[PDB]
Amino acid sequence: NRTFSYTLEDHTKQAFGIMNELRLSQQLCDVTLQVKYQDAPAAQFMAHKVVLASSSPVFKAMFTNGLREQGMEVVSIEGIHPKVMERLIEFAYTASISMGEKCVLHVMNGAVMYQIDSVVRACADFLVQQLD
Amino acid sequence: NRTFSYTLEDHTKQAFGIMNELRLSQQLCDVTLQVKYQDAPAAQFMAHKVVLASSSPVFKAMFTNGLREQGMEVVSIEGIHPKVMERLIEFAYTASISMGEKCVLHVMNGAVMYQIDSVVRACADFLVQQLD
Ligand SMILES: *[C@H]1C(C#N)=C(O)C(C)(C)[C@@H]2CC[C@]3(C)C(=CC(=O)[C@@H]4[C@@H]5CC(C)(C)CC[C@]5(C(=O)O)CC[C@]43C)[C@@]12C
Ligand SMILES: *[C@H]1C(C#N)=C(O)C(C)(C)[C@@H]2CC[C@]3(C)C(=CC(=O)[C@@H]4[C@@H]5CC(C)(C)CC[C@]5(C(=O)O)CC[C@]43C)[C@@]12C
């Protein structure tokens, strides 16, 4: 006689916590980012293409390429330092990003490169506050 | 001289919206649930193992099986009606579930089967309210 409709607000926060745990456990991962910047030593980041796609229109375009790979893809990344890539992956998984004030510019450059619009705004607003 | 730390509250809600769009687009999917219940016609649900794993300890256990499949897995499901499975998948992707009051019991049974604790609580509390 009625339509019972439930909603849990905390769900998306809760699921992303499990998603991040799975990432750190290197479980259910389907992409390895291979980050090589200048003289910096090479770094690998394991991740889920969906989670990266859900936070970045650049990763979404990269991974939604009509037909699907049979499992693990290595994506060669250049132009971002491994430490920057690390922070942007962590943002995608946690909704949080952290950096020292001297590298807000370099995190912004990475966020522009991966079209992570919210952290571009955050970084540009922070840099503008550091002015008279 | 300082630690700049940004956080976007809306991110997890925003990403799940993209995740659900990708599901309906049948993009980046790595599992097909093949649901056969009693006399009901067979149904297929495309999904992302991570998203199902992040919302269900039963799917998490199912998919975190030490070693990974090369792409698309078909999972044969029995004991839940396709309409129940549909609602529980949609919950995992949207944080929302909807049913008519006569089938709160059958949705609960599905949610117990997949250990989706929040909707078990919702359903059990609703059934208990329908009493004197
Ligand atoms: C600066 C910093 C602080 N405080 C950080 O929190 C992170 C985000 C971890 C930065 C990572 C990138 C890195 C290593 C960096 C500082 C830094 O000086 C280098 C450096 C900057 C210049 C010289 C402009 C280009 C090269 C280089 C590098 O060393 O390769 C790029 C990366 C960057 C910005 C932080 C440690
Ligand atoms: C009842 C309903 C309402 N109102 C719903 O919103 C959903 C959740 C869509 C239900 C899906 C499952 C289904 C088809 C159902 C009603 C119903 O009577 C059947 C039926 C119940 C019994 C007879 C107890 C067992 C068999 C059966 C079936 O038809 O296979 C199981 C599924 C169920 C509960 C809703 C339409």
Short mmCIF file of C-alpha atoms in Angstrom, two decimals, chain A residues 12-13 16 19 51-56 88-96 116-119, chain B residues 6-19:
data_model
loop_
_atom_site.label_atom_id
_atom_site.label_comp_id
_atom_site.label_asym_id
_atom_site.label_seq_id
_atom_site.Cartn_x
_atom_site.Cartn_y
_atom_site.Cartn_z
CA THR A 12 29.73 6.82 -0.06
CA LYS A 13 32.29 7.83 2.68
CA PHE A 16 35.52 4.78 -0.31
CA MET A 19 38.03 1.07 -1.73
CA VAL A 51 37.89 5.09 -8.86
CA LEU A 52 40.41 7.06 -10.96
CA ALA A 53 37.71 7.56 -13.68
CA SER A 54 35.16 8.78 -11.07
CA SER A 55 37.53 11.58 -9.85
CA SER A 56 39.37 12.58 -13.11
CA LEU A 88 46.13 13.05 -6.38
CA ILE A 89 45.49 9.26 -6.20
CA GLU A 90 45.00 9.66 -2.40
CA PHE A 91 42.54 12.54 -3.07
CA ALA A 92 40.51 10.32 -5.47
CA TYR A 93 40.27 7.64 -2.72
CA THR A 94 39.84 9.74 0.43
CA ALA A 95 38.40 13.17 -0.67
CA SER A 96 41.50 14.72 1.10
CA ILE A 116 40.74 17.35 -10.83
CA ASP A 117 38.74 20.63 -10.70
CA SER A 118 38.17 20.85 -6.92
CA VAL A 119 41.88 20.76 -5.97
CA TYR B 6 42.19 20.57 1.43
CA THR B 7 39.09 18.34 1.77
CA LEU B 8 35.93 18.14 -0.41
CA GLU B 9 32.92 16.65 1.47
CA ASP B 10 30.82 16.16 -1.72
CA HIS B 11 33.63 14.10 -3.46
CA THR B 12 32.46 10.59 -2.44
CA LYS B 13 28.82 11.45 -3.47
CA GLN B 14 30.16 12.98 -6.75
CA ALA B 15 32.44 10.02 -7.64
CA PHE B 16 29.69 7.45 -6.93
CA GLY B 17 27.46 9.36 -9.38
CA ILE B 18 30.16 8.89 -12.08
CA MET B 19 30.64 5.21 -10.95
#
